[PDB]
Design a protein around this ligand. Structure first.
Ligand SMILES: *[C@@H]1O[C@H](CO)[C@@H](O[C@@H]2O[C@H](CO)[C@@H](O)[C@H](O)[C@H]2NC(C)=O)[C@H](O)[C@H]1NC(C)=O
Ligand SMILES: *[C@@H]1O[C@H](CO)[C@@H](O[C@@H]2O[C@H](CO)[C@@H](O)[C@H](O)[C@H]2NC(C)=O)[C@H](O)[C@H]1NC(C)=O
Ligand SMILES: *[C@@H]1O[C@H](CO)[C@@H](O[C@@H]2O[C@H](CO)[C@@H](O)[C@H](O)[C@H]2NC(C)=O)[C@H](O)[C@H]1NC(C)=O
Ligand SMILES: *[C@@H]1O[C@H](CO)[C@@H](O[C@@H]2O[C@H](CO)[C@@H](O)[C@H](O)[C@H]2NC(C)=O)[C@H](O)[C@H]1NC(C)=O
Lengths: 244, 49, 203, 49, 204, 150, 150, 150, 150, 150, 150, 150
């Protein structure tokens, strides 16, 4: 049931394009030589484990290649394919941040970071400009944590949902109608709400929409904790209190 | 003295702190190494008697 | 035991010096010089905040390390005769590691309320900032210490249960409750760490 | 387990930072000016990479 | 040797003393120690005393071609922390050609009963940054071994001196606490690594 | 009006009320669990009826949490430097009462669990001593609760 | 007229009283439980007749709580920096005396329960010796009273 | 004038006088109790005659209580800080002398109870050596009294 | 307004981040080397099989080195005293995390090396436990990186 | 403003680097010498082969030297108190990393040299583990070279 | 002007440059003496050849002498608080390096001398290891020079 | 003006010199006497030739006296705090050097005296080591001279 969606093919989270191609090359050379490898004597028990795992190693290499492509970090150096979005001349000429040729190298060291008339995501992955920037850490941290939450919630939801089929196969209607429905209900009501909130925050805002303060990063991911007793303020869109 | 003035102190913070800390560090080093050399173990094998 | 003697000597000497300097200060009618308020004021709140964050994550991680090694040695010792325990008991190990996780996310939340100052004087500039810095340092110390201590407790209990499993493999389920009680105690620590820094403004 | 699902992302961040620092510490040093001197030893530095 | 300047309209109220009180306008240093301490008469016009205020004014007609006036402001009140009266220097003003330059004192304060003393009271950073203001000015003044008393003063002699040199400075205390935490961690590591032993004999 | 730095003592009191209570709970639970894991090999039929010391060790943390939550909710930036001292004292008192109660609970649970492992009839008597140990813990709660709001 | 931070000494005096009475009671209960568990392997009947030291630890805890709550009820913002030191002194005295008496009670009970298990006629000595140790703690209470209500 | 605040020294002296004497008496009671518990297994008929060290420790505690109540009765807000130093000196001297006497009588009673298990003639011998112990304590009492009313 | 001595905190943050991780790696290497030397006397073919605890200590040292290099490269003359404390906190955190990780790595690596010398089938399971150790140190690194910006 | 007492920090950093590297090298040399002396009684023909570990320990000492040299050519009375902190941090980092490396190299060298005396097959693995220890020291050097220059 | 107390540092450096190294040498000599006690009884014919550790200790003492003498004559009342700090650092570094070198000298000499009482062939290796430790002390002196001239 | 309490530093320096020289000599002669008493039953007729370590340890007192005299002669009220610091440093250096000589002399005397009781021919080798320890103290003396008249 799992194979690919298992936590053994998303067992990369380190895809660096080149690292994936290296793993695939090693595993492919080893699979091409498996005949003489099994025909010849074994080298060491670790080699025996690697021989038992060759198939998983190769397919994990393919998935690492794909994850490196979507991450757009080839040996920690990004790849520019079919545009990169962003610019500087529109940001400075329109934004009155011009005449910083040498003044920007004398007065505004590492200062300029403002979106003017911009936007539009990379058609495939993450823009290389985020890689060559210095706010890379914050944006990547927020993106990876949100991807974390969504991936983990959908995975655990699928894992629990498989148990419903597992139990309906083994008759037992009392447990199905009394033991696992509460589990799914609680899990959904506590985590799918967080996932939907993450997606809503992602979709229902824009660059020139931060509340008063310039950026605020996210400012709503964590203050909506697992209890949120009262007060809160900030984001209080109508109905959210009642739904909570 | 026409008036009971102070002791005309100096930049007490830096000199006092640094002197006290180097003094206690050197003293602690001395006592710890003298304690280590105090309990030197010759071995006390059967040769002793 | 020489290290213990040195530590005890430093402890007693420092405390004797402290009590003698306190009695000298109160005798010589020099109380105003021994100003705790000036110490808590002129000291930068940034140090308190960052030290709280560092301790919050570091105590958690070192308590988790204590637990994981104190249980792993037990597992490897007791798993020679019964290799089947090399993996099945692992359900009591991740607790300790998950305990360490209860730090990093916590270490994020407090770190989520850090701002620069651009101010130096303490008069009417920093009152709420003073409260925020001290409160977040206290929350960090709370989570770090509680998480470390629950980690060491859970590791101890897990080692005990792992050695119990070496003879009868059917008591692990009946004995799983103690370590989840310890993990819940760590959860209480994390909860109060949340509540302490829940309503604090920094700036 | 929701908290424990956060683990692999720490490996992701650590691997990214390790690759970036390895690059900026070895390759960034290896590629510079005076092409002859900047590439005569590039073989050894790149083998180390 | 020089007696301290004493504003004593009815009884000794303001006591002030230094050693090398000097002033520079547009970087023109000049010493006024003998012109304030050696000479008994002094243009103390405008000098004021109070139960909570003390404005000490010193005027010099021929200084820099104008009647240069120095005003020291002192204020005391009952602090709720200890239910005791604390005095705190507020500011100094320099009056010349109508222009009123300003200087803020940094930590000149103490109990009202006692008397304050400090080593260097100057605006130059090298000799202590005790005097500071945002707007730059042409007045650079230095006072060496500056002692002052304003309230609960009896007799012609200074009371006990609550000097501001201090055992600990905030920077030294922050550094000491940081090094203490580092030493704690390092010594825990050293103690736990020192309690490791080695094999004595092997299997065969 | 209100003196600065006045929340430092209150937050330190809350932090102590958590740390010490949780540490007493953790050590009591650890000792009781060690004893119960040791004894379970010889008589696994009485493991369920011997978790009570662990329950008590865990429950000391709940009074610790009650005090910490109460005085954290009551805390604010504008504390009068007198309520802060009261909360700090209450937190320290509850924390160290949890200390003593947890240590006593852990050691008495270990000893009584071993005794029940060899002599079953001790168990009932065991239970009595346990209550007396908690007679300590909740008492600390009192010296904070009436102290917290007054 | 009245300096603040005066309630500081009073609150920590009450807290120290309660805390140290708690430590003494916990030590007494711990040693008594260890001794009872050790002796219960052979004589199951004497278990219910040998829990006296635990009761003595409990009554020392009662005294500590009583004095602590007496200080707590006598704490107010307008404390005059004279009564507060009396509260601190009374609390520290009663708490530390209770700690010492509890330690003595615990060790004497640990010895006496094993002795009684070996010598059935030793229990009579109990009903004297513990009391003497016990009344030691009571002594502290009285001075606390004469130092608090004054 | 009342320089500084003498009440602090007065209460600290009274508290020290109580606690140190209480601790010494507790240690003496502990040693006597373990000795008598050990000896009861062989000669149970001599238990009643062996409680003398416990009674003398109680007497030491009585001396501590008497000096504490005497030294705290004179305590008042309007103290010139000289009577306060006399207060602290008397309290510290009596308490620490009582602690020393308790230490000595504890060891002496333990060893004598060891000895008397075989040789009853040693019992009267105790009445010599043991007595000097509380004489030491009594000595502290007198140097407190002259200090208390100097 | 740039305060003096600002770079001091960041400098010792980097120094601690390097040094504590180095000490943890050294301890792990020493313990695992002793274990390997003990095990190799009877199973010579299993030397390179379980040399991995040494490379694990090397990995912890690498984490320390990368954090220290990042902090040092982030260092400037005019630190606003808000960045310096961030760097110091991250450095101390990652340093003690590396120390603890090296501690666990060394102890568990020695244990597992002995076990795999005795029982060949135990290696892979040991792997899991051992790998968890690195994760703990890893956490320090990540909690430093977020602390490098916010 | 060129404040005084600034060169003291850099001088202390250089001295600390030198002493800590010296102590690490001395510990490594002492452990290696003890091991080779204990093992040469049986198989003395390979003492030349076993000279390798201590040399690496000596290498650690050389490490410290260069750092000290880097301080010596960069010492001037006019230090802005910002570079002096950098020099002290670099010296402390390299010295303490060398000390940890010396601890590890001494322990592993002694244990493994005894193992090689008992089993020659260890020798190759020798030159692996020890390298890590040496590499560990090199790690610290890197930080120094980063911090000393900037 | 010029800090009058600056000389206090410089002379102190001289003091350090005399004590620690000498003390370390003493330790070495002392330890070597033990070896001579356990070697001449077996075979005293080569007692002349077993004086390497003591003469290395004497060389360390000579290093201490030369550095102390140099810092002594270079000391003067007109120092600028810069030369004083520099001399103090040089003296401390060379003295503690000599102490470490002497510790290593003593340990290695004793172990090897005890070993060579039955296996003469180790003696040549002796020199090499000895030289290393002696060379270690050399480094200390070197840094002293590199501080004195600059 | 001349700063006061400089005679404080000079007097403490001379006192420390005498104190530490006396302590070192006392320990050396103590260990030597223990060795002589141990060896006396072996060969009573060889007591005379075995007192060399005793007198060698006793010599430290004469350096102590000569340094104390050289400092006390220079003692005067009119000292500019620089001569006083020089004398204090010289006294500390010579005292600690004599202390090192005493430890080394005592240890080597005990060990070698036991050995020479076991085997005679060590005797001449004896004086060699002793003379080295002797010259070690000599080092302090000469540096004290350089630090006395300077
Ligand atoms: C106010 O202070 C001045 C300056 O000290 C006093 O002038 C007196 O001058 C005579 C001259 O020999 C000296 O006794 C002292 O310098 C001063 N005497 C006293 C008692 O201070 C002046 O007398 C003071 N006025 C009052 C009312 O005290
Ligand atoms: C007060 O200090 C000032 C500044 O040092 C002194 O003025 C100078 O002193 C030096 C002393 O070497 C002379 O060479 C200069 O000629 C002085 N410059 C002047 C007077 O403009 C002043 O002498 C000091 N006064 C006292 C009384 O010590
Ligand atoms: C003396 O003290 C009195 C207070 O009793 C001062 O009166 C007030 O001072 C403040 C401070 O400048 C002013 O803002 C108020 O306006 C004053 N009150 C009134 C009614 O005017 C007084 O200024 C102080 N100084 C003098 C010279 O009297
Ligand atoms: C106050 O104003 C008078 C105006 O005459 C200044 O006197 C002149 O100042 C200038 C420069 O400051 C000198 O070049 C002249 O020589 C001065 N005299 C004359 C007659 O012009 C005086 O300097 C001013 N005082 C201050 C303190 O600024």
């Amino acid at each position: 049931y799992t194979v690919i969606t298992f936590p053994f093919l998303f067992a990369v989270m380190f895809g660096d394009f080149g690292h994936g191609i290296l793993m695939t090359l090693f595993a492919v050379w080893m699979v091409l030589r498996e005949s003489r490898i099994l025909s010849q004597k074994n080298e060491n028990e670790m080699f025996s484990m690697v021989f038992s795992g060759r198939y998983i190693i190769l397919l994990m290499g393919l998935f690492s290649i794909y994850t490196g492509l979507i991450y757009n970090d080839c040996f920690s150096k990004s790849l520019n394919i079919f545009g990169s979005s962003w610019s500087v001349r529109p940001m400075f000429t329109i934004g009155n941040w011009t005449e910083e040729t040498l003044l920007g190298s004398s007065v505004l060291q590492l200062n300029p970071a403002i979106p003017g008339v911009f936007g539009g995501p990379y058609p495939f992955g993450i823009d290389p400009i985020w890689n060559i920037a210095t706010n890379k850490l914050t944006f990547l941290n927020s993106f990876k944590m949100k991807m974390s939450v969504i991936l983990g919630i959908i995975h655990m939801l699928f894992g629990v949902s498989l148990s419903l089929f597992n139990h309906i196969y083994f008759k037992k209607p009392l447990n199905i109608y009394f033991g696992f429905i509460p589990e799914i209900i609680f899990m959904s009501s506590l985590f799918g709400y967080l996932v939907i909130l993450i997606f809503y925050k992602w979709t229902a805002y824009d660059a020139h929409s931060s509340r008063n303060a310039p950026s605020l990063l996210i400012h709503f991911i964590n203050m909506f904790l697992f209890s949120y007793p009262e007060s809160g303020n900030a984001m209080l869109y109508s109905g959210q209190k009642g739904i909570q | 003295p026409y008036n009971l003035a102070y002791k005309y102190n100096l930049e007490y913070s830096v000199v006092f702190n640094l002197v006290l800390w180097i003094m206690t560090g050197l003293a602690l080093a001395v006592i710890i190494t003298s304690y280590n050399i105090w309990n030197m173990d010759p071995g006390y094998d059967s040769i002793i008697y | 035991t020489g290290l213990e003697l040195l530590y005890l000597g430093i402890f007693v000497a420092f405390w004797a010096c402290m009590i003698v300097v306190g009695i000298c200060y109160t005798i010589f009618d020099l109380g105003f010089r021994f100003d705790v308020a000036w110490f808590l004021t002129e000291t930068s709140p940034f140090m308190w905040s960052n030290l709280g964050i560092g301790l919050a994550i570091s105590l958690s991680v070192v308590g988790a390390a204590w637990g994981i090694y104190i249980t792993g040695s037990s597992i490897i010792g007791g798993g020679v005769k019964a290799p089947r325990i090399k993996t099945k008991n692992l359900v009591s190990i991740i607790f300790c590691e998950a305990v360490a996780i209860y730090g990093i996310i916590m270490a994020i939340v407090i770190s989520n309320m850090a701002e620069p100052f651009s101010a130096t004087d303490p008069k009417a500039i920093g009152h709420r900032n003073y409260h925020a810095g001290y409160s977040m340092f206290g929350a960090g110390l709370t989570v770090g210490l509680s998480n470390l201590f629950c980690g060491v407790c859970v590791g101890i209990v897990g080692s005990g249960a792992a050695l119990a499993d070496a003879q009868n493999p059917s008591l692990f389920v009946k004995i799983l409750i103690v370590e989840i009680f310890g993990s819940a105690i760590g959860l209480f620590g994390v909860i109060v760490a949340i509540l302490q820094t829940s309503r604090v403004k920094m700036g | 387990n929701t908290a424990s699902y956060l683990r692999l992302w720490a490996l992701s961040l650590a691997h990214a930072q390790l690759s970036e620092v390895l690059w900026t510490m070895v390759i960034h040093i290896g590629l510079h000016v005076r092409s002859l001197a900047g590439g005569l030893g590039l073989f050894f530095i790149f083998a180390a990479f | 040797i020089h007696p301290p300047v004493s504003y004593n309209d009815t009884a000794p109220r303001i006591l002030f003393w230094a050693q090398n009180f000097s002033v520079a306008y547009k970087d023109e240093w000049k010493d006024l120690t003998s012109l304030t301490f050696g000479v008994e008469n002094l243009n103390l016009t405008g000098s004021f005393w109070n139960d909570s205020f003390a404005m000490l004014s010193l005027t010099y007609e021929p200084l820099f071609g104008a009647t240069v006036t120095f005003k020291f402001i002192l204020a005391s009140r009952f602090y709720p922390v200890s239910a005791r009266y604390w005095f705190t220097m507020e500011r100094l003003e320099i009056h010349s050609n109508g222009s009123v330059a300003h200087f803020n004192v940094s930590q000149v304060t103490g109990p009202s009963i006692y008397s304050f003393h400090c080593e260097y009271v100057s605006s130059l950073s090298k000799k202590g940054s005790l005097l500071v203001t945002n707007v730059p000015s042409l007045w650079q003044m230095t006072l060496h071994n500056f002692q002052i008393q304003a309230f609960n003063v009896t007799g012609e002699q200074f009371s006990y001196a609550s000097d501001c040199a201090g055992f600990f400075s905030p920077g030294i205390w922050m550094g000491l606490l940081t090094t203490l935490f580092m030493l704690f961690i390092f010594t825990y590591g050293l103690h736990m690594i020192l309690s490791l032993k080695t094999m004595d004999r092997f299997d065969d | 009006n209100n003196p600065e730095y006045s929340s430092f003592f209150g937050v330190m009191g809350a932090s102590s009320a958590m740390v010490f209570s949780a540490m007493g709970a953790a050590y009591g639970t650890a000792k009781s669990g060690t004893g119960i894991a040791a004894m379970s090999v010889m008589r696994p039929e009485l493991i369920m009826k011997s978790i009570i010391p662990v329950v008590m060790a865990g429950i000391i943390a709940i009074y610790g949490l009650v005090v910490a939550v109460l005085i954290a909710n009551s805390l604010t930036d504008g504390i009068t430097l007198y309520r802060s001292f009261l909360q700090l004292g209450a937190g320290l008192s509850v924390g160290l009462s949890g200390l003593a109660a947890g240590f006593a609970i852990g050691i008495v649970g270990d000893a009584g669990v071993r005794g029940t492992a060899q002599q079953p009839r001790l168990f009932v008597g065991m239970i009595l001593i346990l209550i007396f140990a908690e007679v300590l813990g909740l008492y600390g709660l009192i010296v904070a609760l009436i102290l917290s709001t007054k």
